[PDB]
């Protein structure tokens, strides 16, 4: 029974679910909008918030954390060298989950992420 377990897991096995979250957050921090099924939206929400706050504190150690999580190299440098101005005193709750019509082909609930 689920009772108590609160790790949002996707349709995928462990390894591939990791990979999906890392790639998917990378591409969020790259474009700012994104379109994923709602479940992927929630699972993103957690991690991308972690990366943002990880950039709010731009010491080397943390920079190497993020350097290890995100795939694309230079989106990180742009990111932490850019955001502690954007999200100065926003203090948590960085995304926004403006949702949208389903996906012809699955009628799969589909949502559309922001950064604000």
């Amino acid at each position: 029974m689920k009772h108590g377990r609160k790790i949002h897991r996707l349709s995928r096995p462990a390894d591939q679910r990791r990979a999906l979250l890392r790639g998917l957050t990378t591409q969020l921090l790259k474009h700012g909008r994104i379109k994923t099924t709602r479940a992927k939206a929630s699972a993103m929400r957690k991690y991308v918030d972690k990366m943002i706050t990880l950039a709010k504190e731009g010491s080397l150690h943390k920079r190497r954390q993020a350097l290890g999580f995100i795939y694309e190299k230079q989106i990180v440098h742009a990111l932490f060298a850019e955001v502690p101005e954007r999200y100065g005193d926003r203090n948590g709750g960085y995304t926004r989950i403006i949702r949208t019509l389903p996906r012809r082909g699955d009628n799969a609930p589909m949502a559309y992420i922001e950064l604000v």
Partner: protein, 46 residues
Amino acid sequence: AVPKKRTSIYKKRIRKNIWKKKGYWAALKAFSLAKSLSTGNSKSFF
């Protein structure tokens, strides 16, 4: 595992009706989504 005998028209009409009707209930939901999507304050449908 193998059915004995074909069902009547009676029964089958009952179940097909439950199928379609199960489709009935799931329109008025879409009609609420429509009647709300007619331009209005909302955070959905960019």
